Write a protein that binds this ligand. Structure first.
Ligand SMILES: [Mg+2]
Ligand SMILES: [Mg+2]
Ligand SMILES: [Mg+2]
Ligand SMILES: [Mg+2]
Ligand SMILES: [Mg+2]
Ligand SMILES: [Mg+2]
Ligand SMILES: [Mg+2]
Ligand SMILES: [Mg+2]
Ligand SMILES: [Mg+2]
Ligand SMILES: [Mg+2]
Ligand SMILES: [Mg+2]
Ligand SMILES: [Mg+2]
Ligand SMILES: [Mg+2]
Ligand SMILES: [Mg+2]
Ligand SMILES: [Mg+2]
Ligand SMILES: [Mg+2]
Ligand SMILES: [Mg+2]
Ligand SMILES: [Mg+2]
Ligand SMILES: [Mg+2]
Ligand SMILES: [Mg+2]
Ligand SMILES: [Mg+2]
Ligand SMILES: [Mg+2]
Ligand SMILES: [Mg+2]
Ligand SMILES: [Mg+2]
Ligand SMILES: [Mg+2]
Ligand SMILES: [Mg+2]
Ligand SMILES: [Mg+2]
Ligand SMILES: [Mg+2]
Ligand SMILES: [Mg+2]
Ligand SMILES: [Mg+2]
Ligand SMILES: [Mg+2]
Ligand SMILES: [Mg+2]
Ligand SMILES: [Mg+2]
Ligand SMILES: [Mg+2]
Ligand SMILES: [Mg+2]
Lengths: 31, 117, 155
RNA sequence: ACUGCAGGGGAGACUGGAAUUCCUGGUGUAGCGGUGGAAUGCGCAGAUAUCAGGAGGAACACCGGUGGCGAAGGCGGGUCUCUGGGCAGUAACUGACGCUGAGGAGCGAAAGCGUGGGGAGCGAACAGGAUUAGAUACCCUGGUAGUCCACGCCGUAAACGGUGGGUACUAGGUGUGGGUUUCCUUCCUUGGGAUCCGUGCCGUAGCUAACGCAUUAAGUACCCCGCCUGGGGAGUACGGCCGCAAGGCUAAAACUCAAAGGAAUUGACGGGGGCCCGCACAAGCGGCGGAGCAUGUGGAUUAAUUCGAUGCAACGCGAAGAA
């Protein structure tokens, strides 16, 4: 079940990218 | 009033349909009765029964304009590829020369995405 | 079932008529175990018939059965997302039994007083080609002919 | 250095044919298309089909392979031009000039970004149709970016052999690719053997948690580099550097858990595969669910409605006899 180790990383990276896309503007570009 | 004794039967048997056209040797269609022309609709036009009625209809309509002697150019990866030509044989045409003209792309146009069904 | 076909049951010659179809039609008519009753009914049908036929009654009943014999039925099958029917040839021993089963079923609902002469006129009008089972023959036939397009799935 | 050798190594220009699409015309009529089944859609104003011509873009069938080349990423229609590397042999030359390499620099699939072209087909987004409880999907119909080109930027991939580079040694067996060299040498056989460099498979010793690796090591050793120190938090925050942007690189802690993991074993299961069996389906015959009643049970009510039985495998059951 080595793919599980990839899925956890995938979900964490996906949520981080989703947060960055939620804030690619003065929400975060100012900061 | 157009009378020609010799002709060519172009047969296109695609996974959904079959289309049989009778042309002169020069390549001018006279009769084209196809699988939708014979009463069918939807997935039933893919069947060999529809193939061997469409070919029969095309054959009789072409005989009405006066063709005894046809030569067949078949194309397409469909199941109505032999039922059709025996239908032309048994509907009064003489089969003559049989060929294969399915286009073979030398890796040209990019094909559509594979169905994920 | 799983292990091949099952053996059929022999049926002996009728005493009144040197024929087997009478012995088998009476058994079709049979319900709850009144062999005596069903037999007198079949015999009474034929013996009422001969007056209005003149021809031998079993000859008349054969004429009827040749009419109402099926050839090609509409047996069902589901393949993909939609079920449909398959035209399949009917072997004669199934065909005759199905025909006279239709005869019995539609003679149980025909409009006279009682089933002796009900079956009697059923036999004569089936020998003349006008009856309810007769019209079922050529409506089931045309239903199967309209699905011949699916004959290429013969299991 | 010299003589040979193989190759889709790279770049530039020109150029070839199939096929798809579109346009022009000829024929010709009522369908075409598509699906598990349809519909949206296309056509009847002449579609699909078929013939001829033409425009354009992209990719280069057969060769083609398990193969070759390239540091990797990658690389094949053809021709020409320029150009890199590699291999073998001679021993002509230099005479340790080597290996690795922190940092650093360059190259670096695809997607993406900028500018300008191009745009056939495909096709994120989008829209409609369908399916569905819903369907922001899978399937269908269209279809924009993009995919292509030039020049920059990006610098990331399961960028994988999940195996850093160099070197030496340690049974073999069998393919295949590129050279050299000796024996029947003209018996042509283009067989047999040796050797160098690849590239695969199988296997001994050895190693391994096992899977397996095994002269192309994951063996036996040496040199140098990169990296790890339980799982999450997190390759995230903060700072900084780079970038047009997307983001990339460097990179924590607080907190939290006693696990997380890797291989293999036994079962179980699968809308996995194969063989088979069963009133399982199928073909029939007769029924229940409808009515009334008998009986049991849930519920309710009562003073009590004794208690147990509650999918199949409880409910005409314990109860084969409650005034
Ligand atoms: Mg080259
Ligand atoms: Mg062309
Ligand atoms: Mg166009
Ligand atoms: Mg036109
Ligand atoms: Mg056309
Ligand atoms: Mg010297
Ligand atoms: Mg470095
Ligand atoms: Mg670069
Ligand atoms: Mg790109
Ligand atoms: Mg661009
Ligand atoms: Mg953009
Ligand atoms: Mg542009
Ligand atoms: Mg689509
Ligand atoms: Mg939609
Ligand atoms: Mg160029
Ligand atoms: Mg990385
Ligand atoms: Mg790769
Ligand atoms: Mg790695
Ligand atoms: Mg090493
Ligand atoms: Mg080797
Ligand atoms: Mg091995
Ligand atoms: Mg190890
Ligand atoms: Mg930790
Ligand atoms: Mg980061
Ligand atoms: Mg920052
Ligand atoms: Mg793990
Ligand atoms: Mg395991
Ligand atoms: Mg297991
Ligand atoms: Mg199984
Ligand atoms: Mg049994
Ligand atoms: Mg049944
Ligand atoms: Mg009831
Ligand atoms: Mg009780
Ligand atoms: Mg019972
Ligand atoms: Mg008592």
């Amino acid at each position: 079940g080595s793919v599980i180790k990839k899925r956890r990383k995938r979900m964490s990276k996906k949520k981080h990218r989703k947060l960055l896309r939620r804030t690619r503007v003065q929400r975060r570009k100012l900061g | 009033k157009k009378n020609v004794p010799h002709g060519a039967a172009h047969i296109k048997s695609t996974f959904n349909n079959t289309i049989v056209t009778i042309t002169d040797p020069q390549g001018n269609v006279i009769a084209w009765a196809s699988s939708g022309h014979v009463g069918f609709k939807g997935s039933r036009k893919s069947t060999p029964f529809a193939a061997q009625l469409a070919a029969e209809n095309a054959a009789r309509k072409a005989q009405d304009h006066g063709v005894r002697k046809v030569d067949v150019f078949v194309k397409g990866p469909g199941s109505g590829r032999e039922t059709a030509i025996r239908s032309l044989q048994a509907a009064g045409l003489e089969v003559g020369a049989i060929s294969d003209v399915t286009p073979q792309p030398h890796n040209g146009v990019r094909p559509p995405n594979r169905r994920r069904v | 079932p799983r292990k091949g076909p099952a053996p059929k049951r022999p049926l002996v010659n009728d005493p009144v008529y040197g024929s087997q179809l009478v012995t088998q039609l009476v058994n079709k008519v049979l319900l709850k175990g009144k062999k005596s009753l069903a037999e007198r009914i079949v015999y009474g049908a034929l013996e009422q018939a001969r007056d209005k036929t003149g021809t031998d009654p079993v000859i008349t009943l054969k004429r009827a059965l040749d009419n109402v014999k099926p050839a090609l039925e509409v047996r069902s099958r589901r393949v993909g997302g939609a079920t449909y029917q398959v035209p399949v040839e009917v072997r004669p021993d199934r065909s005759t039994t199905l025909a006279l089963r239709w005869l019995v079923g539609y003679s149980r609902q025909r409009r006279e007083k009682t089933m002796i002469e009900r079956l009697a006129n059923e036999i004569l009008d089936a020998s003349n080609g006008l009856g309810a089972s007769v019209k079922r023959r050529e409506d089931t036939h045309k239903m199967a002919e309209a699905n011949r397009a699916f004959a290429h799935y013969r299991w």
